[PDB]
Design a protein around this ligand. Structure first.
Ligand SMILES: CC1(C)CC[C@H](Nc2ncc(C(F)(F)F)c(-c3c[nH]c4c(P(C)(C)=O)c(C#N)ccc34)n2)CN1
Length: 282
C-alpha cells in the first residue's frame, strides 16, 4: 500500500482515523477509513484550496480511505493545557486563521455547521485548518453543531438559516479561548437556551423581529443578562465589540466573517502572533 500505518488516532460513528507516512514523498498524513458524511467530505474538499481548510490529498477503496494533512494538535488541546498561557496576540492569530478560512467557505456558499475547538486543527508550524466537513452543506441544498456552540435560531428549530450558525459557534470558540472553559455548557436543548438568555439577556421583537414565529419558539423567563465587560474582564473595547457582534440574536444583524475581519481589533495592536511562535503542547 501507498501508506505506512504509524498510529491509531481514534474511532467515531463514521471512521477509524490513523497517522501514516506517504511511502513515496515521506510526508506524514491522516487517513479516515470509513455514503453521506463520507461522499460529502470528498464533494467539498477536493474542490477547495485554502491555507485554513484541511486539504484532501488522496482517496481510495471495501472501506473508503480519505487522506488529509496530519495536524499535531487542535484548539481543544490548547484550551485544556494548563502549561500554556494565551496572550492577546495568540488569540488574535487563532481567530484570524479561523475567520479567513470561513470567509473563503462562505464566499464559496458552504456552511461548515460543526465549528467547535476540536475541529480547529493546528499543524507543527501553527497554521489553523478547519476540519470535519461531514456536516457541511451548500447554501443551496435543502434541509447542526454540538449544543454548546449552537445558535438560538437552531435551538428554536429554525428550518432555513445561514452564516450566523457558523458565526455564533466562532464566538463561543473566542469566549472559550478567553475564559479557557466552555462559555455556555447546556446539559440539554432547553438548558442551552436558559444559559444563553441568562448570560446574554432574553431578547425582544426589536432585538429579533421574527423570533416569535420560529417553529419551536417558546416564552422564556426574562433575564437582563450579564454585561460582556464583566465576563471578559481583561478584554479591550475592540475585542468586546467583536464578541457583541458575533452574539447578536437576530441572525441577519449578526456579524459575517468579512465584517469580523474588517473590525478594528484585527488592525489594532498587538497584532497576531507568528505561526511558528504559537504555544505548543507535549
Ligand atoms: C488529539 C489530536 C491533537 C491528535 C492528532 C489529531 N490530528 C488529526 N489530523 C488530521 C485529522 C483529519 F481531519 F485530517 F482527519 C484528524 C481527525 C479528524 N477527525 C478525527 C477523528 P473523528 C472520528 C472524531 O472525526 C478522530 C477520532 N476518533 C481522530 C482524529 C481526527 N486529526 C487531532 N487531535
Amino acid at each position: 500500500k501507498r501508506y505506512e500505518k504509524l498510529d491509531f488516532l481514534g474511532e467515531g460513528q463514521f471512521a477509524t482515523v490513523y497517522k501514516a507516512r506517504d511511502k513515496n514523498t515521506n510526508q506524514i498524513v491522516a487517513i479516515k477509513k470509513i455514503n453521506r458524511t463520507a461522499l460529502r467530505e470528498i464533494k467539498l474538499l477536493q474542490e477547495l484550496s485554502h491555507p485554513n481548510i484541511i486539504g484532501l490529498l488522496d482517496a481510495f477503496g471495501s472501506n473508503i480511505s480519505l487522506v488529509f494533512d496530519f495536524m499535531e494538535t487542535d484548539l481543544e488541546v490548547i484550551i485544556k493545557d494548563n502549561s500554556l498561557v494565551l496572550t492577546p496576540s495568540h488569540i488574535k492569530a487563532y481567530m484570524l486563521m479561523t475567520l479567513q478560512g470561513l470567509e473563503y467557505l462562505h464566499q464559496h456558499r458552504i456552511l461548515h455547521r460543526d465549528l467547535k475547538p476540536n475541529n480547529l486543527l493546528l499543524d507543527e508550524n501553527g497554521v489553523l485548518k478547519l476540519a470535519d466537513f461531514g456536516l457541511a452543506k451548500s447554501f443551496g441544498d435543502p434541509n447542526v453543531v454540538t449544543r454548546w456552540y449552537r445558535a438560538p435560531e437552531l435551538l428554536f428549530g429554525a428550518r432555513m438559516y445561514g452564516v450566523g450558525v457558523d458565526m455564533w459557534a466562532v464566538g463561543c470558540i473566542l469566549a472559550e479561548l478567553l475564559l479557557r472553559v466552555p462559555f455556555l455548557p447546556g446539559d440539554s436543548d432547553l438548558d442551552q437556551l436558559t444559559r444563553i438568555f441568562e448570560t446574554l439577556g432574553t431578547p425582544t421583537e426589536e432585538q429579533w423581529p421574527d423570533m416569535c414565529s420560529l417553529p419551536d419558539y417558546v416564552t422564556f423567563k426574562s433575564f437582563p443578562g450579564i454585561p460582556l465587560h464583566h465576563i471578559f474582564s481583561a478584554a479591550g473595547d475592540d475585542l468586546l465589540d467583536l464578541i457583541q457582534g458575533l452574539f447578536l440574536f437576530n441572525p441577519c444583524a449578526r456579524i459575517t466573517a468579512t465584517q469580523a475581519l474588517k473590525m478594528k481589533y484585527f488592525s489594532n495592536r498587538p497584532g497576531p502572533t507568528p505561526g511558528c511562535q504559537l504555544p505548543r503542547p507535549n
